Structures are given as C-alpha cells and as structure tokens.
C-alpha cells in the first residue's frame, strides 16, 4: 500500500510541476501590463478594488 502511495506522490509531483509553470508564465505577462498601466490608469481608475 505504501509503495502505491509513493507512486501517488510521483503523480502529485508532476501535477505540481504543471501548476508551477502556469504561475511563472502568468507573472511574466503581469509584469508587462503593470509596466504600461502606470499611465495613471492603475492609480484608481482600473484598480476598482471593491
């Protein structure tokens, strides 16, 4: 049983790997948008924090 749980760990590890690529690739674009938005839009107009 515990060996099969180890193989579960491997499957979960590759799932984690997928999620991790998602996160880093997303930030790469967040960078650009928040660079351009600094033309006073983000101050309060686009950032409707409600």
């Amino acid at each position: 049983e515990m060996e099969n749980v180890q193989k579960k760990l491997r499957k979960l590890e590759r799932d984690y790997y997928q999620i991790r690529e998602q996160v880093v690739s997303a930030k790469a674009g967040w960078c650009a948008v928040m660079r351009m938005v600094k033309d006073n839009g983000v101050e309060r107009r686009l950032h409707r924090r409600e």
Partner: protein, 72 residues
C-alpha cells in the same frame, strides 16, 4: 556565469533590470515585492533549477545575495 540565471530571473519576476538589485537590500521591503511576489520569486527560482526548497530554507532568501548563496 550561472548566476546570470538568478540575476536574470529576479528582474523578470520583479520588473527591475539586472543591475537594479543591490546585494545589501532586501526583497521584502527594499524591492517592493510583497508576500505573494516573494513567494512567486522563490517558486520561480525553484522551477528554473529543477530543484526543491522547503519552507524553512525558502524563508531565508529575504536578502538579495541569499538567492545565490543557497544556489552555488
């Protein structure tokens, strides 16, 4: 050299350029990266080097230099 990875990735994760980061400064407050941003930075570092960093060790990267200290 290999550090070009870190000093590149850091910028790509924080919006600053390669030379902007100073070894004396701290990510948490002197770079503008909040808790979420620093988590993203450390986790991107984890992804790049195909390795793992537990929570305890990961929390010891608040300073700029540490990003290479644990690497090399």
């Amino acid at each position: 050299t290999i550090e070009e990875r870190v000093k590149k990735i850091i910028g790509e994760q924080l919006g600053v350029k390669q030379e902007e980061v100073t070894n004396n400064a701290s990510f948490v407050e002197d770079l503008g990266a909040d808790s979420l941003d620093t988590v993203e930075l450390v986790m991107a570092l984890e992804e790049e080097f195909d390795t793992e960093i537990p929570d305890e060790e990961a929390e010891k990267i608040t300073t700029v230099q540490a990003a290479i200290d644990y690497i090399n």
